[PDB]
Amino acid sequence: AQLMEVNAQINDLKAQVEKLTQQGETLRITQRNLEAAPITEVLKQEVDELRQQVSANDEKLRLVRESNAIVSDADMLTLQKNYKDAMTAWATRRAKCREVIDTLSEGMGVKPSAFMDQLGLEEGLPMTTYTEMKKALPPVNVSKADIKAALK
């Protein structure tokens, strides 16, 4: 019935509708993105609130730090090392002293005690407490470089 006229038109618009629908959905996508974002006045708020909220923690850190309420990993290392240094310095200077006191005792053929009494050398503390101190709290070795690594 020369329906080519009409059966062509369907094809024409079957192309047209499709175009708009495949364009249509695109709009939807972007508007979704638009509905999922805050305005630029509210986003300007939330930021100057977060700024204050962060600055807050910077102050809390400044305080608990300045008050020595807390110990940093580097500091906890440094005290730890300084301890080794002292307990070493101690156990060392005692020894390299009492070993000379040894020779010098029988040099004069006399007890070490009275030698220390004459020269005016101090009793010391006992090693009873030193070793029980190493026991209580064990010294450890701590590299200076380790301490630099903790400080960053």
Partner: protein, 128 residues
């Protein structure tokens, strides 16, 4: 056959109207939404900050968590013990310098031999 193929053209006209009105509603809603939200170097440099800060927080609370790991009772225990040991190390230092006095000015021993025997070194000092 003819009308059967005529109906398929009656479906797509209605479909086109519906799709057209839909697109209209869409462009409208965007037109209203793009009002508050407007892409700018400002809003751009802004969203980035609402993230930056947001993250910096999580970093901070991590910092805290980690900072509290360190027992200050121990820090003090250490602090006290070392004070003790250093006063003791300073004691035996004083005893060593005293043996230097006697050995040098009484037993007239060797100023070279004395150092080496006592343990006196370069930069031998009290612990401050």
């Amino acid at each position: 056959r003819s009308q059967a193929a005529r109906t398929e053209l009656a479906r797509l006209q209605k479909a086109l109207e519906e799709q057209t009105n839909f697109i209209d509603k869409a462009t409208a809603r965007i037109e209203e939404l793009k009002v508050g939200r407007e892409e700018t170097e400002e809003r751009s440099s802004l969203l980035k900050e609402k993230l930056a800060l947001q993250v910096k927080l999580e970093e901070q609370r991590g910092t805290f968590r980690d900072l509290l790991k360190n027992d200050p009772d121990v820090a003090q225990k250490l602090r006290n013990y070392t004070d003790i040991a250093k006063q003791e190390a300073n004691l035996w230092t004083d005893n060593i310098f005293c043996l230097q006095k006697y050995m040098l000015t009484k037993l007239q021993m060797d100023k070279k031999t004395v150092s080496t025997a006592l343990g006196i070194t370069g930069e031998f000092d009290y612990l401050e």
